[PDB]
Amino acid sequence: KEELKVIYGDNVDVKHFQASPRTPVQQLFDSLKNAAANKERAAKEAAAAASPYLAYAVTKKQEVQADPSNIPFDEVLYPQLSEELLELELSDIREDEIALEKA
Amino acid sequence: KKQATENLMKLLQAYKDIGDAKSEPLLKNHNPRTFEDRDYPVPDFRTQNLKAGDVPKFFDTVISTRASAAIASKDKFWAGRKTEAEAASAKASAAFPRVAVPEWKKGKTVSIENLNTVTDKYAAALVPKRKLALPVLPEGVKKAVEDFAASVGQAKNASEVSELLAKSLAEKAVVTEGGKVVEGFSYVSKAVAAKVIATRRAEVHERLLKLWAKRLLVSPELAIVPLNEFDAQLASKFEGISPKYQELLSAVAQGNK
Amino acid sequence: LSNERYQLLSQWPDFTTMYGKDFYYRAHPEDLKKFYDAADEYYKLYETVTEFDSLSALASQVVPNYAARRRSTVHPAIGSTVADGAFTNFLLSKQ
């Protein structure tokens, strides 16, 4: 909810994204619909920073953050860990199915 | 403190390259299910002389004892791995990069073209080591197709044509390790993984519904004993089962007349 | 002097090269919590060695004791060696 409330509002409807998480395409198209407001916020904050250092730091952070290729996807970064995190829940469901086939 | 940090980093590198020499999965050894003994002789509750309310405490004692044994087996594994990587963190390389801090000499002052490059070294660590090349559509290409859609008079669906092009590029977004494309790298996303979990979960839940459908079609009296209060009725011998629901189960079983 | 401490905080090995989940899950849980404590400690040391607005109030604790040592009843520049040499001249001359 804290990760999504900056995009989808305050009535973020967290159940819909818990059940069905966002595809990487929807992560792209949700990084692209606030990029104008993000760049205007970064310009209004780099103008009002107390240092040219801090102004360069906030414009560099927005330069490396607004790029949608820089979203860290754990499924791309660590494939084996993501499939093991899948099998951690598939194994619990398999234990329930083994109990139901024993019954 | 710097030596302790360097020792800890040599220890983490030792952990990684002796976890990759065995090539083992990452979550295999942090999961205490993998250290759980599945083939233990599984104590029979009927040979322990329980009273009525004493059977779920017996089940809780057996389950928690076996879980504590699994956790202790996990801990003994990690004590063995800790000594195995303490033996390899000693004979190491210890050529790590240093923390980028701005250049400040003794009498001199720092320049902003060095603070800015250490900020660039900080923001260069915010890119991921392997990323999807998600193609953002530039304005110069979405407009070069938007005026083309405006040439044939379909300019009101021209934004639709542009976003369909952007989505069609986004679905086949290829991965990028260091600028170069890892060809043939296949990944399974998080939405696809949760869809797989949802379908497998729904099929096991309908097997639960089918199980209880048979057991309540044949003997529908079972609905009067609630599921949380079921093995609170049990005992070791059948004559020790608590008679709270026994008479009602016998009288509901004879039907509606 | 803060420069000579900051020079040995410039020689600290980069621990943000080991923040990935490759090093998380291969590593012992206690050694990982120790590694995260070591990174937190470096951030504490680096936040406090670059607080340079505190040196101007640290210097005001060396000033009053030094100024009271110079505010001497004999001389501002007196020390033990000159006073010893004058004690030989006072003592080894007659009475």
What is d(CA A61, CA A46) in angstroms, rounded to the nearest whole number? Answer: 11
Best of B113, B195, B204 to disrupt the A interface (most A CBs within 10 Å) is B204
Question: Is there a contact between A93 and B25 if contact means CB atoms under 8 Å apart?
Answer: no
What is d(CA A22, CA B189) in angstroms, rounded to the nearest whole number? Answer: 10
Residue showing tokens 């803060």: C2
In chain C, what residues touch A74 (CB-CB under 8 Å)?
21
The H or E element that residue C55 is part of is: helix C55-58
The H or E element that residue B20 is part of is: none
Contact B135, A83 (CB under 8 A): no
Q: Which amino acid is at B149?
A: A
Q: Which residue of B has its CA nearest to A73?
A: B131
Strands B175-176 and B131-132, how do they pair? antiparallel
End-to-end CA, chain C: 50
What is d(CA B59, CA B64) in angstroms, rounded to the nearest whole number? Answer: 8
**A73 contacts chain C (CB < 8 A):** no
- Give long-range contacts, CB 8 A cutoff, 24+ apart: B134-142: B134/A24, B134/A28, B134/A68, B134/A69, B134/A71, B134/B170, B134/B173, B135/B166, B135/B169, B135/B170, B135/B173, B136/A28, B136/A32, B136/A67, B136/A68, B136/A69, B136/B166, B137/B162, B137/B165, B137/B166, B137/B169, B142/B166
Residue among B189, A25, B14, B249 nearest B241 (CA): B249
What is d(CA B232, CA B52) in angstroms, rounded to the nearest whole number? Answer: 6
What resolution in Å is listed for this PDB structure? 3.1
Interface A-C: count of C-beta contacts within 8 A:
8
Q: Is the dihedral of CA B45, B50, B52, B57 positive or negative?
A: negative
Task: Tell me chain C's radius of gyration from C-alpha atoms.
Answer: 27
End-to-end CA, chain B: 83
- What SS3 state is found at C13? strand
Contact B122, B100 (CB under 8 A): yes
A24-55: string of b/e by CB count within 10 Å (b at 16+)?
bbebbbbbbeebeeeeeebeeebeeeeeeeeb
What is d(CA B12, CA C34) in angstroms, rounded to the nearest whole number? Answer: 11
What is d(CA B221, CA B232) in angstroms, rounded to the nearest whole number? Answer: 18
What is d(CA B42, CA B44) in angstroms, rounded to the nearest whole number? Answer: 7
With 0-12 / 13-18 / 19 or more C-beta atoms within 10 angstroms meaning exposed / middle / buried, residue A82 is: buried
Q: How many CA atoms lie within 13 A of B2 on its CB side?
A: 16
- Number of C-beta neighbours around residue B75 at 10 A: 13
Chain B nearest C-alpha distance from A52 (Å): 8
Contact B132, B175 (CB under 8 A): yes
Chains with 3 or more CB pairs closer than 8 angstroms to C?
Answer: A, B
Question: Is there a contact between B187 and A79 if contact means CB atoms under 8 Å apart?
Answer: yes
What is d(CA B102, CA B132) in angstroms, rounded to the nearest whole number? Answer: 32
Contact B46, B237 (CB under 8 A): yes
Q: Which amino acid is at B98?
A: R
Residue among A23, A38, C34 nearest B191 (CA): A23
Question: Is there a contact between B101 and C46 if contact means CB atoms under 8 Å apart?
Answer: yes
Contact B134, A71 (CB under 8 A): yes
In chain C, what residues touch B97 (CB-CB under 8 Å)?
13-14, 17
- Number of C-beta neighbours around residue C87 at 10 A: 11
Compute, in degrees rounded to 10, the torsion defined by CA atoms B246, B250, B253, B257. -130
Q: Which amino acid is at B77?
A: F
In chain C, what residues touch B14 (CB-CB under 8 Å)?
none
What is d(CA A82, CA B27) in angstroms, rounded to the nearest whole number? Answer: 10
Please give the structure tokens belonging to residue B195.
Answer: 């869809």
Residue among A5, A2, A4, A34 nearest A22 (CA): A4
Contact B110, B102 (CB under 8 A): yes
Question: Is there a contact between A100 and B126 if contact means CB atoms under 8 Å apart?
Answer: no
Contact B24, A81 (CB under 8 A): no
What is d(CA B88, CA B94) in angstroms, rounded to the nearest whole number? Answer: 12
Contact B131, B175 (CB under 8 A): yes
- Number of C-beta neighbours around residue B127 at 10 A: 15
Contact B63, B36 (CB under 8 A): no
Chain B nearest C-alpha distance from C50 (Å): 11
Phi, psi (degrees; rounded to nearest 5) at B98: -100, 160
Nearest to C26 among B16, B97, B104 (CB): B16
Written as one string, the DSSP assignment of B127-193 is S-SSEE---PPPHHHHHHHHHHHHHTT-GGGHHHHHHHHHHHHHHTPPEESSSS--TT-----HHHH
Contact B249, B224 (CB under 8 A): yes
Residues contacting B244, CB < 8 A, separation 6+ = B233
- What SS3 state is found at B98? strand
Solved using: cryo-EM
Residue among B23, B38, B36, B17 nearest B77 (CA): B36
Please give the structure tokens belonging to residue C22.
Answer: 């490759």
What is d(CA B16, CA C17) in angstroms, rounded to the nearest whole number? Answer: 13
Question: Is there a contact between B5 and C12 if contact means CB atoms under 8 Å apart?
Answer: yes
User: According to DSSP H, which parts of chain B are helical?
Assistant: 2-19, 55-89, 112-123, 139-151, 158-171, 190-218, 246-252
Question: Is there a contact between C31 and B19 if contact means CB atoms under 8 Å apart?
Answer: no
